Amino acid sequence: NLPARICRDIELFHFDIGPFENMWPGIFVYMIHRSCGTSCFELEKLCRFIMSVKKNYRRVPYHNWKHAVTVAHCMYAILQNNNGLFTDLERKGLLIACLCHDLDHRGFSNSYLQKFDHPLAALYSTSTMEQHHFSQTVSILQLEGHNIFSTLSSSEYEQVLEIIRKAIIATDLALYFGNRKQLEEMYQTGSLNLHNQSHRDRVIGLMMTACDLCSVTKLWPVTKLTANDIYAEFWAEGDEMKKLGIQPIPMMDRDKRDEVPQGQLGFYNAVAIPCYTTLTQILPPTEPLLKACRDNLNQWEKVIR
Ligand SMILES: Cn1cc(-c2ccncc2)c(-c2ccc(OCc3ccc4ccccc4n3)cc2)n1
Ligand SMILES: [Mg+2]
Ligand SMILES: [Zn+2]
């Protein structure tokens, strides 16, 4: 059963899930139980599912099991602070989606798989890894005793899988820019309609980006350390680009590592700050994410000075 410190601090947007891997499954179950009720899933089926998901994450520096649970936690914090906005089915689906959203990640970008001519890039031409992550989710669900959605009607099953598919695909950052642009226009013109399924899908998309990027919304020591893990992957990809005979972009080129603070400044300006700004506009209770993001921006600026 969850430690008292975790019971309290799990409610903070900037909660960090700690270094004890065996505690993460219980942390996830607790979040499921709190958002979705204890009768939502059969406990034994749920536990079996969680452990098979864990098993199909790889031991890569960043896109790993810890990332999955962290992203799920941010979604939990959003849902908890926006009571009554999201349906029972959306809440179950999104938390499951977050847990599954990087399944079987290799630590390489879609761009790298394309340049490598990987079989997955022939199968899934766009949002390559994200299509795979969804494929893996379904495969796990179809294992004997793993169908946590077995108590839903066929219709609700199809519905929640579609919620999950859309949510997982939305974590393709390439899609974020267009999505956020549309949402910002809808907000400014007062045309955003949460009762409109297409608009709803966009908001959920933005939520997924916000959760996926949430390492930039932690307190500075956490954010600073996490940056090590993301660059470990990017620089390895850069190495691999060089081995293909292709000059990587500076972000992936370990030779350009001294420019990390400037690169971070660019990312916060172009992606992170706009993302959380738009999210807070639509869901005011998410403001702590934006505050924490601005704080980290300031820290990077301080590094530069
Ligand atoms: C999907 N996603 C999550 C993250 C993230 C970010 C921070 N903490 C955890 C996760 C990122 C991400 C985006 C940009 C980035 O660097 C931008 C950049 C650009 C030019 C550069 C030139 C030289 C050196 C470095 C340079 N970095 C690093 C990570 N993408
Ligand atoms: Mg991903
Ligand atoms: Zn992710």
Structure tokens at 256: 């350009």
How many other β-carbons are positioned within 10 Å of the β-carbon of residue 28?
Answer: 25
Q: Confirm or reject: Cβ of 209 under 6 Å from ligand 1.
A: no
Q: What is d(CA 283, CA 277) in angstroms, rounded to the nearest whole number?
A: 10
CA distance 294 to 298: 6
- Residue 145 Cα distances to 44, 85, 139, 149, angstroms: 9, 32, 12, 11
- Structural contact between residues 134 and 208, judged by C-beta atoms closer than 8 angstroms: no
- H helical segments located in 21-172: 24-36, 43-55, 65-80, 88-100, 110-116, 119-123, 128-141, 154-170
Residue 88 annotated as lining a ligand binding site: no
Neighbour-count burial for 164-196, b at 16+ CB within 10 Å, e otherwise: bbbbbbbbbeebbeebbebbbebeeeeebeeee
Confirm or reject: Cβ of 229 under 6 Å from ligand 1: no
Between CA 19 and CA 57 the distance in angstroms is: 16
| Top-tier CATH class for 1-305 | mainly alpha
| Residues 6 or more apart whose Cβ sits within 8 Å of residue 47 | 25, 29
The DSSP annotation for 282-297 comes to H-GGGHHHHHHHHHHH
Judged by DSSP in three states, 134 sits in: helix
Give the ligand whose atoms come closest to the C-alpha of residue 170.
2
| Degrees to nearest 5, angle at CA 131 with 130 and 134 | 85
CA triplet 209, 43, 49: central angle to 5 degrees?
50
In angstroms, the CA 290 to CA 132 distance is 31
Nearest 5°: the CA angle 28, 68, 78 is: 65
Rounded to whole angstroms, the Cα distance separating 51 from 282 reads: 35
Residue nearest to atom 27 of ligand 1 (CA): 263
Residue of minimum CA distance from atom 24 in ligand 1: 260
Among the listed residues 41, 19, 11, the one whose alpha carbon sits nearest the alpha carbon of residue 288: 11
Q: Could you tell me the CA-to-CA distances from 175 to 7, 166, 192, 239, 293 in Å, in that order?
A: 35, 11, 19, 26, 21
d(Cα 101, Cα 282) in Å, to the nearest integer? 23
Residue 132 appears among annotated catalytic residues? no
Structure tokens, 110: 């879609």
Tell me, in angstroms, the distance from the centre of ligand 1 to residue 220's CA: 16
Q: At what angle do helices 88-100 and 197-212 cross, to 10 degrees?
A: 40
Closest C-alpha to 210, from 288, 263, 136: 288
Is 117 annotated as ligand-binding?
Answer: no
Nearest residue to 237 (alpha-carbon basis) of 109, 130, 121: 109
Using a 6 Å cutoff on CB, does residue 68 contact ligand 1? no
User: What CA–CA distance (Å, rounded) separates 228 from 253?
Assistant: 14
Cα angle 129-32-44, degrees, rounded to a multiple of 5: 90
Could you give the angle at the alpha carbon of 58 between the alpha carbons of 209 and 105, nearest 5°?
Answer: 40
Nearest CA to ligand 1 atom 2: 213
Spatial separation of the C-alpha atoms in residues 251 and 233, rounded to whole Å: 11
Pocket test for ligand 1, best of 230, 259, 262, 296 (most atoms within 8 A of CB): 230
Task: Give residues whose Cβ lies within 5 Å of ion ligand 2.
Answer: 102, 171
Residue 285, classified by CB atoms within 10 Å of its CB into exposed (0-12), middle (13-18) or buried (19+), is: middle
Per-domain residue ranges of the chain:
1-305
Ligand nearest to the CA of 171: 2
* Nearest Cα to Cα of residue 90 among 200, 180, 169: 200
- Output the six-digit token pair for 140: 């796990």
In angstroms, this model's resolution equals 1.5
List C-alpha distances in Å: 96 to 66, 149, 150, 178: 15, 11, 14, 25
Distance CA 76, CA 33 (A): 11
And the tokens for 7? Answer: 């019971």
Considering every ligand atom, which ligand is closest to the CA of 270? 1
Q: Which of 203, 193, 212, 279 is nearest to 75 (CA)?
A: 212
Among residues 14, 33, 63, 146, the one annotated as catalytic is 63
Annotated binding residue at 67? yes
Q: CB–CB of 112/251 below 8 Å?
A: no
Please give the backbone phi and psi of residue 228, each rounded to the nearest 5 degrees, phi first. -50, -45
Helix (H, G, I), strand (E, B) or coil at 70: helix
Using alpha carbons only, give the angle 130, 219, 178 rounded to the nearest 5 degrees: 35
Report the chain's terminal Cα–Cα distance, integer Å: 46
Look up residue 81 and give its DSSP letter: T
* Distance in Å, CA 143 to ligand 1 centroid: 36
- Tell whether 264 is in a known binding site: yes
Element (H, E) at 238: helix 220-243
Secondary structure, 3-state, 148-189: CCCCCCHHHHHHHHHHHHHHHHHCCHHHHHHHHHHHHHHHHC
Q: Does the C-beta of 220 come closer than 6 Å to ligand 1? A: no
Question: Cα–Cα distance between 275 and 253 in angstroms, integer?
Answer: 26
Torsion of CA 151, 152, 154, 159, to 10 degrees: -150
Token pair recorded at residue 193? 């309609």
